[PDB]
Amino acid sequence: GPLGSEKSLEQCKFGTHCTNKRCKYRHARSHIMCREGANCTRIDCLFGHPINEDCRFGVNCKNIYCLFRHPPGRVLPEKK
Ligand SMILES: [Zn+2]
Ligand SMILES: [Zn+2]
Ligand SMILES: [Zn+2]
Numbered sequence: 257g258p259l260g261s262e263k264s265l266e267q268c269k270f271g272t273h274c275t276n277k278r279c280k281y282r283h284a285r286s287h288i289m290c291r292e293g294a295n296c297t298r299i300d301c302l303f304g305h306p307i308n309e310d311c312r313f314g315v316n317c318k319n320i321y322c323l324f325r326h327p328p329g330r331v332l333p334e335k336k
Pocket of ligand 3: 311312313314317318319322323324325326
């Protein structure tokens, strides 16, 4: 069905911190990281979807739904 001004399937950089409500890209507003990741076709997703960028924390980062890429051998917590 119909959609607003956010029809770009790429993501914004600032996630939860993006300040514009009409902004053109997908935004991670929720703590859920997406099942389809960057191959996801959903404009309606509030979930974490990746961006081609290097994270500010790398191996020190513990954000499950983070916007930027992380190095090999990095660990993240789970409850499973
Ligand atoms: Zn934005
Ligand atoms: Zn998605
Ligand atoms: Zn990160």
